[PDB]
Design a protein around this ligand. Structure first.
Ligand code: UA1
Length: 289
């Protein structure tokens, strides 16, 4: 059971049914996803030489889908590829960079031809450090390892901040590159944004920037662990594309497919409900127009 597609003209009713009896059928469906992917090993991530490279020693990339850095255990970063419907490597999911792994993070962005980064955590959340401030504080260039980075703009909007960076690393396919960074600043850990409208607009906005680019590379998405908030963002991106393309939508299949590639993408039942509320809301709006 890989997939549960719902005809869009039947979604409103499907979701009502799932929501009946205090989410009885919603919870049953959600729990069917619990073990997807969990047959897979993270032996490289567990090597003692890699210990300090993991923010959370229990949140590790599967061997089968991990992102590898060029050799300098020098290859290791806590990050995982997510293939697309049409081609490999549509997303890279990663943890919030650590002070000691930020050079590795930027190496990865450089080597993987990444032009867009989506961050859906704050650096400190309820007194706990969740992510290093791994980008410059101002417009003065700085080295991260053998990569030079310079912030060209920082635009603080109501619910996200967009930064543009120029980066140069060890030359392969390119020698210098503009990167955009999308930092969504209103998503509580273990929770959901306060409205569907907010994250739907964020996803649409990011996908807009992606789609308009002559060549985007994999999009890097991270929160603190690269699990709950990253999983929910990516799922919504996929499901929104489904609604713009097809007459059915498959939230269960989207989450299923993410979990094949990194541990338990989408952390909570509430996050699963929120994806359904998003789809419900888009469809209601569209029906009237
Ligand atoms: C200090 N360590 C931690 O907090 C770790 C790692 C972690 C995971 C997910 C997130 N959220 S995020 O991925 O959105 O950044 C942050 C941190 N947390 C966990 O492992 C949490 C622990 C937890 C918290 C609350 C709850 O009700 C049940 C279980 N477990 C957990 O996320 O389990 C998965 C990996 C199977 C999804």
């Amino acid at each position: 059971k890989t997939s549960c597609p719902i005809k869009i003209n039947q979604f409103e009713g499907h979701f009502m049914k799932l929501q009946a009896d205090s989410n009885y059928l919603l919870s049953k469906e959600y729990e069917e996803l619990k073990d997807v992917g969990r047959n897979q090993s993270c032996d490289i991530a567990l090597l003692p030489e890699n210990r300090g490279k993991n923010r959370y020693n229990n949140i590790l990339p599967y061997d089968a889908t991990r992102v590898k850095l060029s050799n300098v255990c020098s290859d290791y970063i806590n990050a995982s590829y997510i293939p697309g419907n049409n081609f490999r490597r549509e997303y890279i999911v990663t943890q919030g960079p650590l002070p000691g792994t930020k050079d590795d993070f930027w190496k990865m962005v450089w080597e993987q031809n990444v032009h867009n980064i989506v961050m859906v955590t704050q650096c400190v959340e309820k007194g706990r450090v969740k992510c290093d401030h791994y980008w410059p504080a101002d417009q003065d260039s700085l080295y991260y390892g053998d990569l030079i980075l310079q912030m060209l703009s920082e635009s603080v909007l109501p619910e996200w901040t967009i930064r543009e960076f120029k980066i140069c690393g060890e030359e392969q396919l390119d020698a210098h590159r503009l990167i955009r960074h999308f930092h969504y600043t209103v998503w509580p850990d273990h929770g959901v944004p306060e409205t569907t409208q907010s994250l739907i607009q964020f996803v649409r906005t990011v996908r807009d920037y992606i789609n308009r680019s002559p060549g985007a590379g994999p999009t890097v998405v991270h929160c603190s662990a690269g699990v709950g908030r990253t999983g929910t963002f990516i799922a919504l991106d996929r499901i929104l594309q489904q609604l713009d393309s097809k007459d059915s939508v498959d939230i269960y299949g989207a989450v299923h497919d993410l979990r094949l590639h990194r541990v338990h993408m989408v952390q909570t039942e509430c996050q699963y409900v929120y994806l359904h509320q998003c789809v419900r809301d888009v469809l209601r709006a569209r029906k009237l127009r």
